């Protein structure tokens, strides 16, 4: 009955701010490692939008984004240039401005960016 | 083609700490096949083309990397044969998404020590 949102993230305060604001727009869907992987894959397939905070390098976040692209999901990636890091070319280079968006942001504005996207 | 096409993935923008090991792996992979591996878009598109051409995808997954994870996720969805190599001597716990993707056949994750990487590759490709 509500949109289904999937959040990926490797910072705790910013993650909590993002997850809390996502609840305005829908349900945020997000044993052993295999059971974790299969539950995450099931939630990815159910998701209407996949949101990832990509400032911290993470194999798991990258993997989730790769699976999400192959499932043809709408994807929003959020990067903080103030980190001083250069974002992976595989993530920056996947952006097409519509179905796969990569947005640079300053920490104070993250809720305004999500409101604009949703 | 004649030779198996091999795709190698390792951290770059996530960190170049293991660059010298990557060269040793690529050197041994060359024994068993052809190693195939707007600036960011061009890197993404060429890498995806090589990934699609690959018969085997080999990834060193010790250093956390968005790009290596992304390549592995696209490779799984392309139903590629995948070998991931992880070094427990790093002190790291490998991401559950990578460890949990392993099925022991088409997606394998092997723990190894740096000194045995040539013997590991010889066994996998035998
Ligand atoms: O500038 C580059 C060149 C290659 N790759 C591809 C090939 C590597 O296997 C992997 C490294 O990803 P990062 O560590 O740069 O995120 O992605 C990049 O992401 N960025």
Numbering used by the authors:
A (entry chain A): 19 to 28, 35 to 54, 71 to 158
B (entry chain B): 18 to 54, 71 to 159
Sentences from the paper on this structure:
DNPH1 catalyzes the hydrolysis of the N-ribosidic bond of 2′-deoxynucleoside 5′-monophosphates to produce 2-deoxyribose 5-phosphate and the corresponding nucleobase.5HsDNPH1 also accepts canonical 2′-deoxynucleoside 5′-monophosphates as substrates, albeit with very low reaction rates. The dimeric form is common for DNPH1 and is essential for catalysis. The overall fold is similar to previously reported inhibitor-bound structures of HsDNPH1 and rat DNPH1,6−8 with a five-stranded parallel β-sheet core surrounded by five α-helices.
We solved the crystal structure of unliganded human DNPH1 and took advantage of the slow reactivity of 2′-deoxyuridine 5′-monophosphate (dUMP) as a substrate to obtain a crystal structure of the DNPH1:dUMP Michaelis complex. To investigate the structural basis for catalysis of N-ribosidic bond cleavage, the structures of unbound HsDNPH1Trunc and dUMP-bound complex were solved with data to 1.7 and 1.42 Å resolution, respectively. Omit (Fobs–Fcalc) maps showed electron density for dUMP but only in half of the binding sites of the dimer. The dUMP 3′-OH donates an H-bond to one of the O atoms of Glu104 −COO– and accepts an H-bond from Gly27 −NH. The other O atom of Glu104 −COO– is locked in an apparent LBHB with the Tyr24 −OH. Glu104 −COO– sits underneath the 2′-deoxyribose moiety of dUMP, 3.8 Å away from the dUMP C1′, a position suitable for nucleophilic attack on the anomeric carbon of the substrate. The main change reflected in the active site upon dUMP binding is the stabilization of the Ile29–Glu34 loop via polar interactions with the 5′-PO42– group, with the side chain of Arg30 closing as a lid over the substrate. An intriguing hypothesis for this observation invokes the enzyme harnessing the binding energy for the 5′-PO42– group to drive a conformational change that traps the substrate in a caged Michaelis complex conducive to catalysis.
